[PDB]
């Protein structure tokens, strides 16, 4: 349907998959990384009804489905379900055949090896894609943001990777990776709202809480002052409409959940928080690198859309940083949608045509080729 | 010798072309039944010989 064998770009995370073609500005479609399955016995006959549902089908029919995510903390653990998600992504909504297009997939630099290897195998064996590449999330964010140097703090649904990059090169000894993510904030919000009389323990309830989080929650610039008021007055509560007509209001819980990014102890995690790890990613780099990383804190990934987060991340690191020097945050309206955007940019670069793995080299090496050719 | 190389290549390609046709035929057969099931979904409530004996008896 395209006038060129443009690469397909699929930003497959632990949240939603954003997909479209290289050279465009935006994904053609977005899909929950979900395969749904009925938890009930059918009663009426000739009702259609699938054994399993994919993406938005799984979410739309969720009233009686248990919903599973094949990707956890950035890694595919269930590749049969990813084959279904990709079939849907490519043939039902983008309506393209990867057999005629190179495909670009994304991951964090320390994502366990099985992820990129199984992603490579699925696209070469079930879709028979002519070429593959698995790209770095930080690289993709840097292209989207217009930078070659900076800290990419990618606090999304799966993991926070936090990798410093200078002149387009990794500074791997300074990756302050953290097992704290948007999915934990969602789990925390389900629990804290349960305490308000609105229990959220089932799949339908979990999807509702994620929707509540995305629309009602924030981190603010000053937690203690924000809570001093939110805990004292109803003036800071915000309502939300649930699908069945219930109305829930959230007070200080509205920010106490999200605050776990700065205070991980709220969910039992042992961590300094995302702002200290951002600071250390800069500090652990050489002294002639530090000045450029301080001036370029690059925000990407999920959770970047919480009110007060860009302002707060700059405040928290500038407060740890030395005086005289200027410390700055980069947080464009392209935040979180930067990995997909970077995929489009990267896939299309003329210099990247030497990075793509072809369905030639693949057959001689097998999927393990991804560890020889990508990064 | 060129012809032998050409016939060998053409049948390799031919197999894939025939397989591609087969795949689209298969999709039509599958789509057709889904449509038939949906047709039954709305036609079913009236597929009866009705209201004759009601007056005859």
């Amino acid at each position: 349907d395209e006038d060129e064998t443009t690469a397909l770009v699929c930003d497959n995370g632990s949240g939603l998959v954003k997909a479209g073609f290289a050279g465009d500005d935006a994904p053609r479609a977005v899909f929950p990384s979900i395969v749904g399955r009925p938890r009930h016995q059918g009663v009426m006959v000739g009702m259609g009804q699938k054994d399993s549902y994919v993406g938005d089908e799984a979410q739309s029919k969720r009233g009686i489905l248990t919903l599973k995510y094949p990707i956890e903390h950035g890694i595919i653990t269930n590749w049969d379900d990813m084959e279904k998600i990709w079939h849907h992504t490519f043939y039902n909504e983008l309506r393209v055949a990867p057999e005629e297009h190179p495909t670009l997939l994304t991951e964090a630099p320390l994502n366990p090896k099985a992820n990129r290897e199984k992603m490579t195998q699925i696209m070469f064996e079930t879709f028979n894609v002519p070429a593959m590449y698995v790209a770095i999330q930080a690289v993709l964010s840097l292209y989207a943001s217009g930078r070659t140097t900076g800290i990419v703090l990618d606090s999304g649904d799966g993991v926070t990777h936090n990798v410093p990059i200078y002149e387009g090169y990794a500074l791997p000894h300074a990756i302050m990776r953290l097992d704290l993510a948007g999915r934990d904030l969602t789990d925390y919000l389900m629990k804290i709202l349960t305490e308000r009389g609105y229990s959220f323990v089932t799949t339908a309830e979990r999807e509702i809480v994620r929707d509540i989080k995305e629309k009602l929650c924030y981190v603010a610039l000053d937690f203690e002052n924000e809570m001093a008021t939110a805990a004292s007055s109803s003036s800071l509560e915000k309502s939300y409409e649930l699908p069945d007509g219930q109305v829930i209001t959230i007070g200080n819980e509205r920010f106490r959940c999200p605050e776990t990014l700065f205070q991980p102890s709220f969910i039992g995690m042992e961590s300094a928080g995302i702002h200290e790890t951002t600071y250390n990613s800069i500090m652990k780099c050489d002294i002639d690198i530090r000045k450029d990383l301080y001036a370029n804190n690059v925000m990407s990934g999920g959770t970047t859309m919480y009110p007060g987060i860009a302002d707060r991340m700059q405040k928290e690191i500038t407060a740890l940083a030395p005086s005289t020097m200027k410390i700055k945050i980069i947080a464009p309206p392209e935040r979180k949608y930067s990995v997909w955007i970077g995929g489009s940019i990267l896939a299309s670069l003329s210099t990247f045509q030497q990075m793509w793995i072809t369905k030639q080299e693949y057959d001689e090496a097998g999927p393990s080729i991804v560890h020889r050719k990508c990064f | 010798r060129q012809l032998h190389a050409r016939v060998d290549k053409v049948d390799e390609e031919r197999y894939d072309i025939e397989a591609k046709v087969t795949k689209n035929i298969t999709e039509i057969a599958d789509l057709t039944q889904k449509i038939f099931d949906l047709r039954g979904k709305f036609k079913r409530p009236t597929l009866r010989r009705v209201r004759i004996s009601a007056d005859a008896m």
Binding site: E125, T126, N128 | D11, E12, Y15, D16, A19
Partner: peptide
């Protein structure tokens, strides 16, 4: 001290 592609590859070649 004491693959789906292999199947299709074979079909077209056979």
């Amino acid at each position: 001290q004491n693959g789906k592609r292999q199947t299709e590859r074979e079909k077209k070649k056979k």
